[PDB]
Amino acid sequence: MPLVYMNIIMAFAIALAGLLMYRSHLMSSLLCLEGMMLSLFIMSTLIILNTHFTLANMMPIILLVFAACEAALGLSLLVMVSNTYGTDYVQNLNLLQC
Amino acid sequence: MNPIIYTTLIMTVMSGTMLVMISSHWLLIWIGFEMNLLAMIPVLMKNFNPRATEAATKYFLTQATASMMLMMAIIINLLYSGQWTITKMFNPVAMTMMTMALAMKLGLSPFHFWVPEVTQGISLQAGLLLLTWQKLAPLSVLCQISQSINPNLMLTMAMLSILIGGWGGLNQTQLRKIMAYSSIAHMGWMTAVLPYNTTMTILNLLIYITMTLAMFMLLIHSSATTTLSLSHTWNKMPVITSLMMVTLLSMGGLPPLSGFMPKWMIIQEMTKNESIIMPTLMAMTALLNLYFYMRLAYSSSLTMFPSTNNMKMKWQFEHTKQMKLLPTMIVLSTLVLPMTPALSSLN
Amino acid sequence: LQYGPLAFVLGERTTRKLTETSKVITVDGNICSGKGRLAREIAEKLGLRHFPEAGIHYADSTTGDGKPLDVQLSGNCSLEKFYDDPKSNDGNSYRLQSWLYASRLLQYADALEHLLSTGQGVVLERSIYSDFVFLEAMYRQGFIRKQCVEHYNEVKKVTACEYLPPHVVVYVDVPVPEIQSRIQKKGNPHEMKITAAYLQDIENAYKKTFLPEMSEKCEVLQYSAREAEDAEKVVEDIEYLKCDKGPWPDQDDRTFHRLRMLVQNKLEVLNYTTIPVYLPEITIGAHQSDRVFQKFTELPGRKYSPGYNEDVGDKWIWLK
Amino acid sequence: LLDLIWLETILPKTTSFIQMKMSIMVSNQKGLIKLYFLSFLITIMISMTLFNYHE
Amino acid sequence: NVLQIVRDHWVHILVPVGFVFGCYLDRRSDEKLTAFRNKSLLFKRELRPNEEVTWK
Amino acid sequence: MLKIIIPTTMLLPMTWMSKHNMIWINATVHSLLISLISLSLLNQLGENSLNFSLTFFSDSLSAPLLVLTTWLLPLMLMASQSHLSKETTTRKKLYITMLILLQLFLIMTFTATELILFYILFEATLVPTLIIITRWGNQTERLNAGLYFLFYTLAGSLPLLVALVYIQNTTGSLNFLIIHYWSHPLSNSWSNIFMWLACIMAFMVKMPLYGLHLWLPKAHVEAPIAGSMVLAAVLLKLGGYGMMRITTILNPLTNYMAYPFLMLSMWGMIMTSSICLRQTDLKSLIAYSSVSHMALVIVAIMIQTPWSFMGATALMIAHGLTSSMLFCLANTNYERVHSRTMILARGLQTLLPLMATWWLVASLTNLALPPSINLIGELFIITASFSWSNITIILMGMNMMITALYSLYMLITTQRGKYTHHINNIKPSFTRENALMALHILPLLLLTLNPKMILGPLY
Amino acid sequence: KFYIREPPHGSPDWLKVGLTLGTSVFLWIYLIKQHKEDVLEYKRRNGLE
Amino acid sequence: MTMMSGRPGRVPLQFLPNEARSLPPPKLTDPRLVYMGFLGYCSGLIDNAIRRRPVVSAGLHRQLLYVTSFVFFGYYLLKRQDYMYALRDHDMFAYVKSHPEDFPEKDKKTYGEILEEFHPVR
Ligand SMILES: CCCCCCCCCCCCCCCCCC(=O)OC[C@H](COP(=O)([O-])OCC(O)COP(=O)([O-])OC[C@@H](COC(=O)CCCCCCCCCCCCCCCCC)OC(=O)CCCCCCCCCCCCCCCCC)OC(=O)CCCCCCCCCCCCCCCCC
Ligand SMILES: CCCCCCCCCCCCCCCCC[C@@H](O)O[C@H](CO[C@H](O)CCCCCCCCCCCCCCC)COP(=O)(O)OCC[N+](C)(C)C
Ligand SMILES: CCCCCCCCCCCCCCCCC[C@@H](O)O[C@H](CO[C@H](O)CCCCCCCCCCCCCCC)COP(=O)(O)OCC[N+](C)(C)C
Ligand SMILES: CCCCCCCC/C=C\CCCCCCCC(=O)O[C@H](COC(=O)CCCCCCC/C=C/CCCCCCCC)COP(=O)(O)OCCN
Ligand SMILES: Nc1ncnc2c1ncn2[C@@H]1O[C@H](COP(=O)(O)OP(=O)(O)O)[C@@H](O)[C@H]1O
């Protein structure tokens, strides 16, 4: 493979680890989700352009649309959490246990 | 919520699940999952409270992570083969990502932590939907790619799911958490047989869905979410408690009840493949689920707990809303063992 | 077509029936005050439906035949023996208070259902909002325990927050000596034993907690004993009130639909009355519970659903 | 010594004690998503190494 | 005179009818296992001039 | 076989359609009629079994057990109706329904041709017994007793299910006839050893084997009278019947796989007989005596000789009848004085002479007086053990001595001496109780005239 | 006897009862005809009758 | 893990292929159909019990509809199940016929000439 493929894959891995490891702010994790989506977009676009598969040139656009849907969902949930607690910290979300 | 809006959201959830069901293209399956999650998030929050908000947030985070892993696996599979069809993945790493993603979507161990909390934080109707309808799509995807799964990882996750479901259910007094741990154990049982026979997985899915629907409807009818609240139902609706006790015995897998048939068929199918140790451990561990079912039956129907004075006023009122399918679900959850050979129609 | 989501979707709405005369009205006052006559007169003048004060057997009036049932099958408390022995070690006092709160909750649900379904207004004597004055009076007189007050507060917190407060709160003011004098002139031997401290506690609870609390979300009309006989004047005072204070103007079709779904289905209304808090005064053992439940089921029209008891003349059961 | 103590100790009481301890260990979680997602990362790292390298 | 006693004692026929039905079903089940009738090497026999089967 | 099953099922709508004051009469009459009908299965062919159809068959081993179950149901109904008088009509009908379902599962269990159906019914017997024990038991320990009874059984039974499906996969069938005719030796391997254990331990724990018997005192003491009757008389024999059916395919491994079980059974029968000597509860003594008798049955089954199986069958039948009679006798006194302590009520012979006669006859049959069938089975088992090894006679004689000792100890403690002064509520014996004791005891003595009816297929 | 509406009154809902009975009758007749057609088709395909 | 879903010439969503019509339909007195009707009757009785109606006599039309629906569905369920088992046997026999080298017929010996080991019981 090209080394750019490894760079994009490691970008995805770093963003996934950033999401999986949580600091105080909820907003930081949403940004990590958006970063994973961006890396997926870049990787899929590179794969589609390299192989000249004409019909999937539209697939990353659909990816972006559902990324926007995910981001809107996350922001709405953050609005409700911050309205409840006055802060978007994840440690406030501990009313429910296992 | 406007009833029209609620109907539209439920139809959107169902249509996303059906899109996952009928698609031949990986992108369309991903789209179905995305639409299902998007329409599912408001349903968890229909009755607004901080607990519902927290449950919805945890659910969204878990499912979004699973969706990201799903898409990454699809992209790897495309990279190593210019294929979009869901037939059999061509890369072991992509397949491992796919398995981890689908297990996180299903709530299999060790990705089980979200299920009890989300189930506890929502209403009983949302819990019913989450524990019945939300399992169809990832299970269908796993059924389509069954020949590609690594048996070691899948069976490890299934055994962990059964063990953790039993142990977690041992410690619960809230009914929703009990049902969530029961769901985790049943998912483990279902995914244990998937690498060998998808028909067994489908049969286990159908029986588990029937029993879970009957149990959740019985819990809605007697509007209780804790053990002590359900302990009062004998003094107002003894028939409901008796049906609950019989359904609980069925869920424990005791013959000649219906819940025994999926475990029996899974064990015999696994023995056909020279797998003896793991089904033995699986049954010996489902003994724990039977134990906490029996504890609930002791507290609910077989003995009579003390009641309160205000129950006399409740004695004078009937149920305004009646559930149409509750009688059928109870009968199918209990008395369908003699109809076992009908499973051939599932393949 | 029973009211539900289907009825709300096609056609049926609540706001289209509000006609400026709905005005949930409660006419409160101390013991033996003429609040009942004033409330009935207000209902007759304004054309609203009148609700007599909810007693021990209010639930009996709404189910089956309107006849009351036996005390041990309904209520399991006596107001007379509360006057006789308020400190009895059988828990009669708090049992009576909790049963009366449940009855008032049921009556409030029925009145709200009537107003939301027909648009016609309702008039209530007391309410779940003013029920706590008796609880506070009992607690200050040493009639109930602190735990009983805590359980009452828990039940009220989980129940009364689901409903809209009344538009108009009418308080009939009678000084405690006049209350006592009316008590002796009445003739009931049990009410003769009501001490002045108990009535003073009720009046203090009213004037220090209830009226200031309702004045923030409702408009209050106070009337002395002498000026409470002028029903026409009180009605004229009500007819010239601007209801721009409480949450009622903040209500649209969806909140009305939720409230109408809640006011019917009386089991959902009463759900949180029987919470598993084990107070000795209200906890009933398994044997007594079983015996009383069987005896209730042996009542002539209570074994089956209303239209399915053939011994009270129901017909075509095999085709129902 | 045998029926009331040791036969009780070996089969049923040991099982009850072990299952109670395991249930307490499994079900006593603080409800913080930080710990859960850290465990998710650990599990992912294991599956890709102890399983994904073996085929 | 018999209407009320029938209405209060009709339950006493369920078990005898079940017994008769069980015997009838046992005969029907016997009817499905006639593959080796008069075919065993030990009991194979020549039919009587008027009989049709060796057992039923 | 349908002529037995269908009336048993018809018992359910018949008792659900009965009047509130006629349920006991109707159920008893039709249960007795069903027992009379089932009595016709004792006509056995000798060479082979009675194969009614593909699903059911009757053997010389199954027929006495079926007759015992059908005969036990009316006695259970007679014993139950006294302590259930205050119950509502619906709950009494539910109790009778539990009894009828238990009878149906038992009669189907003993006649199944195929081992998976036998397993399904043999597990299905659990639910009615559990419901009876945990709902109509008297004390607060009934919940713990039910949990013990359920989980001890299931922990042994699940490996049996795994072994059965594996065996059907490897052989192609589990039908008992095909299993017997196509039997092949089990080699000496770890896989075969664990297959043997999985095929044996469920029936071991149902007997129960000593060391796995802790559930039995709890369940038998904490259950109502009918529950104890069915637990001691019939449900203990499921393990023995299963062993006799399953050891056909276990040879030649049983030759040395039976050593720990034989050792456990002999020493534990000694231990339980000794335990009966120091017991403050009257029902626990009967339970432990049952454990000792079933240990002797386990030895008889393990040694695999025709005389051993004949003695085991006779001992199973005799023990069932005797244990049911003893439990009923204890229940009468418990109903009188509302306590299970043996020394609370003494000198009952002065107050109840006929019940004292019933006590004496039951104690004599418990110690296996000749020529009762109890001693027939015990002597056959002892002779078979002596053929197996001459040193077994020491343990057999010790067990006989201790059995006589605690039997007569119970009789003397309960019936002899002087009455307790303060206890003044001991009423004369009812016709129902005396009739129940007579209906227990008379078949026992009548079986002596025709011992071959209960000796089994090896006769 | 009863105080209020009691939606099941002395007479039953004849529309609902008629619809239920008609549904049952139609289902039974359809099943009978389907079984007859199945038997005839099976005989014709295998040349029995 | 998916045995017969990919069988050639399989129409996706029929539930009853035309080839199934060559098989004998189940009899209308089939014990499995009787059990389905009994299940419908139990559903009707439970429906009566839950709604606090007379369990045995309240809804006769409803119980009739329950039994009829259960029998109607069970008939087609039995047809599909029998057809699937017929397909399984057909495919098995065809495969056995087409692969004689994997299912050989070896001469069977009589028991007088097969030596079995004897294990005495003692
Ligand atoms: C294997 C071979 C075949 C076996 C068959 C399978 C087993 C039986 C079938 C199961 C389903 C059928 C019945 C289900 C619906 C019934 C629901 C009910 O509650 O019944 C009340 C009802 C009595 O109430 P009512 O008459 O309306 O008035 C009294 C009041 O309601 C006063 O009532 P209440 O509600 O106020 O009383 C309160 C009571 C209310 O509690 C109950 O009533 C218990 C009901 C539990 C429902 C059963 C679960 C669902 C089915 C699963 C069965 C599993 C079987 C496997 C073995 C496991 C055993 C658990 O609560 C309690 O007292 C606490 C009890 C807790 C103790 C734990 C035991 C409870 C569970 C035991 C279930 C055993 C299986 C069902 C036995 C039959 C029960 C009726 O029972 C009946 O009258 C109907 C029973 C059947 C009659 C129909 C027979 C047809 C007529 C003859 C025609 C002949 C046909 C053949 C022709 C031959 C030619 C002539
Ligand atoms: C309280 C009551 C509970 C129920 C009791 C159940 C009793 C179960 C015991 C099973 C009986 C014996 C099992 C197997 C028979 C022989 C076992 C072994 O010790 O024998 C030697 C086996 O050699 C070694 O000992 C191997 C076994 C050593 C490991 C086993 C651990 C034993 C420790 C005791 C643990 C307690 C077990 C029960 C837990 C409750 C024989 O030597 P060899 O001829 O070469 O091997 C024969 C097998 N071949 C043919 C396949 C080769
Ligand atoms: C608790 C008991 C289970 C209850 C299950 C729910 C019962 C209600 C369902 C309503 C029945 C209608 C469903 C189907 C009717 C038409 C649809 C039909 O065309 O589907 C076909 C298939 O038919 C259905 O799948 C058969 C459904 C029958 C379910 C009953 C089996 C239950 C197991 C044994 C218990 C006995 C139940 C007793 C009945 C109450 C399509 O075949 P195919 O597209 O190629 O297969 C898809 C799956 N593949 C590709 C992965 C193989
Ligand atoms: C309530 C108390 C009762 C306890 C009873 C529990 C004992 C049950 C007996 C053992 C259970 C497991 C048996 C497994 C089922 C047998 C099937 C079989 O024979 O398969 C074996 C498989 O054998 C095994 O896998 C057995 C391994 C053991 C797994 C679980 C071990 C748990 C503890 C075992 C010892 C305890 C059993 C006796 C204790 C009794 C109670 C104290 C061989 O198959 P293949 O792989 O094809 O080999 C031939 C081709 N190469
Ligand atoms: N919540 C309550 N707690 C205790 N007693 C109550 C309560 N509500 C009403 N009562 C009793 O109702 C009796 C008379 O009711 P009241 O309205 O004061 O007089 P009137 O019948 O003239 O309207 C009083 O003896 C009073 O104690």
Short mmCIF file of N, CA, C and O in Angstrom, two decimals, chain C residues 10-63:
data_model
loop_
_atom_site.label_atom_id
_atom_site.label_comp_id
_atom_site.label_asym_id
_atom_site.label_seq_id
_atom_site.Cartn_x
_atom_site.Cartn_y
_atom_site.Cartn_z
N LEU C 10 -57.41 12.56 14.75
CA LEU C 10 -58.51 12.95 13.86
C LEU C 10 -59.53 13.74 14.68
O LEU C 10 -60.24 13.20 15.52
N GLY C 11 -59.56 15.05 14.48
CA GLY C 11 -60.61 15.84 15.08
C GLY C 11 -60.33 16.35 16.48
O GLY C 11 -59.73 17.41 16.66
N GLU C 12 -60.79 15.57 17.46
CA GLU C 12 -60.91 15.97 18.86
C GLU C 12 -59.75 16.83 19.35
O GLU C 12 -58.58 16.46 19.20
N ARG C 13 -60.09 17.98 19.93
CA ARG C 13 -59.14 18.88 20.57
C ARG C 13 -59.77 19.42 21.84
O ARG C 13 -60.99 19.41 22.01
N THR C 14 -58.92 19.90 22.75
CA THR C 14 -59.40 20.41 24.03
C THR C 14 -59.66 21.91 23.99
O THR C 14 -60.71 22.37 24.46
N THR C 15 -58.73 22.69 23.43
CA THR C 15 -58.84 24.15 23.48
C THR C 15 -60.09 24.66 22.78
O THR C 15 -60.59 25.74 23.11
N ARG C 16 -60.63 23.90 21.82
CA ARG C 16 -61.83 24.32 21.12
C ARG C 16 -63.07 24.29 22.01
O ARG C 16 -64.11 24.83 21.61
N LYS C 17 -62.99 23.69 23.20
CA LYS C 17 -64.11 23.62 24.12
C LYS C 17 -64.01 24.60 25.28
O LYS C 17 -65.01 24.83 25.96
N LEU C 18 -62.83 25.17 25.52
CA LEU C 18 -62.67 26.16 26.57
C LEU C 18 -63.45 27.41 26.21
O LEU C 18 -63.29 27.95 25.10
N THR C 19 -64.30 27.89 27.12
CA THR C 19 -65.19 29.01 26.84
C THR C 19 -65.18 30.00 28.00
O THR C 19 -66.23 30.51 28.41
N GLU C 20 -64.00 30.25 28.56
CA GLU C 20 -63.77 31.35 29.49
C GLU C 20 -64.50 31.13 30.82
O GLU C 20 -64.33 31.91 31.76
N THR C 21 -65.28 30.06 30.92
CA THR C 21 -66.05 29.76 32.12
C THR C 21 -65.69 28.38 32.66
O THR C 21 -66.46 27.77 33.40
N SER C 22 -64.51 27.87 32.30
CA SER C 22 -64.09 26.57 32.82
C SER C 22 -63.63 26.69 34.27
O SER C 22 -64.23 26.11 35.17
N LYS C 23 -62.56 27.46 34.50
CA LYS C 23 -62.28 28.08 35.79
C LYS C 23 -62.45 27.09 36.95
O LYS C 23 -63.42 27.15 37.71
N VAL C 24 -61.54 26.12 37.03
CA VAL C 24 -61.51 25.22 38.17
C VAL C 24 -61.49 26.06 39.45
O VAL C 24 -60.56 26.84 39.67
N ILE C 25 -62.51 25.90 40.29
CA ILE C 25 -62.68 26.70 41.49
C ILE C 25 -62.74 25.78 42.70
O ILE C 25 -63.46 24.77 42.69
N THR C 26 -61.98 26.13 43.74
CA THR C 26 -62.02 25.43 45.01
C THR C 26 -62.39 26.42 46.10
O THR C 26 -61.82 27.51 46.18
N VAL C 27 -63.35 26.03 46.94
CA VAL C 27 -63.85 26.89 48.01
C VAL C 27 -63.41 26.27 49.33
O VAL C 27 -64.11 25.42 49.89
N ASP C 28 -62.27 26.71 49.84
CA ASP C 28 -61.69 26.14 51.05
C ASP C 28 -62.12 26.94 52.28
O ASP C 28 -62.70 28.02 52.19
N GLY C 29 -61.81 26.38 53.44
CA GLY C 29 -62.17 26.98 54.71
C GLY C 29 -61.93 26.01 55.84
O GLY C 29 -61.66 24.83 55.65
N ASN C 30 -62.05 26.54 57.06
CA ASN C 30 -61.82 25.73 58.25
C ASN C 30 -63.02 24.81 58.49
O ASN C 30 -63.98 24.76 57.71
N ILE C 31 -62.96 24.06 59.59
CA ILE C 31 -64.00 23.09 59.91
C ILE C 31 -65.30 23.82 60.21
O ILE C 31 -65.30 24.88 60.85
N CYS C 32 -66.41 23.27 59.72
CA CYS C 32 -67.77 23.70 60.02
C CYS C 32 -68.09 25.08 59.45
O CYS C 32 -69.17 25.62 59.72
N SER C 33 -67.20 25.65 58.65
CA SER C 33 -67.53 26.88 57.95
C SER C 33 -68.53 26.60 56.84
O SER C 33 -68.69 25.46 56.38
N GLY C 34 -69.22 27.65 56.40
CA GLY C 34 -70.24 27.49 55.39
C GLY C 34 -69.70 27.44 53.98
O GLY C 34 -70.33 27.95 53.04
N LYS C 35 -68.54 26.81 53.80
CA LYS C 35 -67.92 26.74 52.48
C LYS C 35 -68.74 25.88 51.52
O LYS C 35 -68.75 26.15 50.31
N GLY C 36 -69.42 24.85 52.03
CA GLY C 36 -70.19 23.99 51.15
C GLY C 36 -71.37 24.70 50.51
O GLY C 36 -71.61 24.57 49.30
N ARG C 37 -72.11 25.47 51.30
CA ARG C 37 -73.23 26.24 50.76
C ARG C 37 -72.75 27.27 49.75
O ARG C 37 -73.37 27.43 48.68
N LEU C 38 -71.66 27.96 50.05
CA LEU C 38 -71.11 28.94 49.11
C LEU C 38 -70.67 28.27 47.82
O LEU C 38 -70.92 28.80 46.73
N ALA C 39 -70.01 27.12 47.91
CA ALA C 39 -69.56 26.42 46.72
C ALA C 39 -70.73 25.97 45.86
O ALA C 39 -70.72 26.11 44.63
N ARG C 40 -71.78 25.43 46.50
CA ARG C 40 -72.96 25.00 45.75
C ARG C 40 -73.65 26.19 45.09
O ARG C 40 -74.10 26.10 43.94
N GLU C 41 -73.74 27.32 45.80
CA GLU C 41 -74.34 28.52 45.23
C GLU C 41 -73.52 29.03 44.05
O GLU C 41 -74.09 29.45 43.03
N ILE C 42 -72.19 29.03 44.17
CA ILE C 42 -71.34 29.46 43.06
C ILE C 42 -71.54 28.56 41.85
O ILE C 42 -71.64 29.03 40.71
N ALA C 43 -71.60 27.25 42.09
CA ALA C 43 -71.82 26.32 40.99
C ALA C 43 -73.16 26.56 40.31
O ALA C 43 -73.26 26.52 39.08
N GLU C 44 -74.21 26.81 41.10
CA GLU C 44 -75.52 27.06 40.52
C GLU C 44 -75.54 28.36 39.73
O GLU C 44 -76.13 28.43 38.65
N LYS C 45 -74.90 29.41 40.26
CA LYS C 45 -74.91 30.71 39.58
C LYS C 45 -74.11 30.66 38.28
O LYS C 45 -74.63 30.98 37.20
N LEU C 46 -72.85 30.26 38.37
CA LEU C 46 -71.98 30.23 37.20
C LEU C 46 -72.31 29.09 36.24
O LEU C 46 -71.77 29.05 35.14
N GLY C 47 -73.19 28.16 36.64
CA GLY C 47 -73.52 27.05 35.78
C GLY C 47 -72.49 25.95 35.73
O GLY C 47 -72.45 25.19 34.76
N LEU C 48 -71.65 25.84 36.75
CA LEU C 48 -70.60 24.83 36.79
C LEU C 48 -71.09 23.60 37.55
O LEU C 48 -72.02 23.65 38.36
N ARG C 49 -70.44 22.47 37.28
CA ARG C 49 -70.74 21.23 37.98
C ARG C 49 -70.16 21.28 39.38
O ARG C 49 -68.99 21.64 39.57
N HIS C 50 -70.97 20.92 40.37
CA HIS C 50 -70.56 20.96 41.77
C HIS C 50 -70.08 19.59 42.22
O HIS C 50 -70.69 18.57 41.89
N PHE C 51 -68.98 19.58 42.96
CA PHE C 51 -68.44 18.35 43.54
C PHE C 51 -68.52 18.43 45.06
O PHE C 51 -67.76 19.21 45.67
N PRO C 52 -69.40 17.68 45.71
CA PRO C 52 -69.39 17.64 47.17
C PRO C 52 -68.06 17.09 47.67
O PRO C 52 -67.40 16.30 47.00
N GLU C 53 -67.67 17.55 48.86
CA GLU C 53 -66.35 17.23 49.40
C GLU C 53 -66.14 15.72 49.46
O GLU C 53 -67.02 14.96 49.87
N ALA C 54 -64.96 15.29 49.03
CA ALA C 54 -64.64 13.87 48.96
C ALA C 54 -64.48 13.31 50.37
O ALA C 54 -63.66 13.80 51.15
N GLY C 55 -65.26 12.28 50.69
CA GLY C 55 -65.21 11.63 51.97
C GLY C 55 -64.50 10.29 51.91
O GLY C 55 -63.72 10.00 51.00
N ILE C 56 -64.78 9.47 52.92
CA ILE C 56 -64.19 8.14 52.98
C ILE C 56 -64.71 7.26 51.85
O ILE C 56 -63.98 6.44 51.29
N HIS C 57 -65.98 7.43 51.48
CA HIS C 57 -66.63 6.57 50.50
C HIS C 57 -66.87 7.28 49.17
O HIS C 57 -67.83 6.96 48.46
N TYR C 58 -66.01 8.24 48.82
CA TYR C 58 -66.16 8.92 47.54
C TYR C 58 -65.96 7.96 46.37
O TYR C 58 -66.72 8.00 45.39
N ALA C 59 -64.95 7.10 46.45
CA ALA C 59 -64.68 6.15 45.37
C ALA C 59 -65.86 5.21 45.16
O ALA C 59 -66.12 4.77 44.04
N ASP C 60 -66.59 4.90 46.24
CA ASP C 60 -67.78 4.06 46.12
C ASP C 60 -68.84 4.73 45.26
O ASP C 60 -69.59 4.03 44.55
N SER C 61 -68.94 6.06 45.31
CA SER C 61 -69.97 6.77 44.56
C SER C 61 -69.76 6.70 43.06
O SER C 61 -70.71 6.91 42.30
N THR C 62 -68.54 6.40 42.60
CA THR C 62 -68.21 6.45 41.19
C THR C 62 -68.11 5.08 40.53
O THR C 62 -68.05 5.01 39.30
N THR C 63 -68.09 4.00 41.30
CA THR C 63 -67.92 2.66 40.76
C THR C 63 -69.09 1.78 41.16
O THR C 63 -69.67 1.94 42.24
#
